[PDB]
A = this chain, B = another copy of it.
């Protein structure tokens, strides 16, 4: 037989997937975020990428129905900048925030069950003590 594994591949393809999102190519979902009195914001993304990092997004998108293109999802109770940072983590595996936003990012991460950054935001808040 013969087996080969490029360890760095998933990182590279994740980068191209993030490029297609920024170029708004091949996107099938638009997240319309309306939070309190802050201005509304739209984020286009790929359902399969969001589903691969968030079980909440996975159940939200796996409905057993054949979609016919762009689906609009209204998202409530989370600031647009926090949703953007979560979307960035799903595509790039990195997330950044000011120390006074770590609490809000954790709230959004708990809400969408992104365990990796829930644990990271929990760890940072504990050693602030």
A residues whose Cβ falls under 8 Å from a Cβ of B: 1-7, 9-14, 16-17, 20, 25-26, 28, 46-49, 51-53, 58, 61-62, 66-70, 89-90, 93-99, 102, 116-117, 120, 124
Contacts and interface: CB of A to CB of B under 8 A. Distances in A.
Contact of A93 (B5, B25, B49): B5
A94 B20 contact: no
Given A1-B99, A2-B97, A102-B2, A26 B61 contact: yes
Contacts of A25: 62
Among the interface residues A46, A52, A53, A97, which one has the most CB atoms of the partner chain B within 10 A? A52
A51 B89 CA distance: 20
A9 B76 CA distance: 26
A48 B17 contact: yes
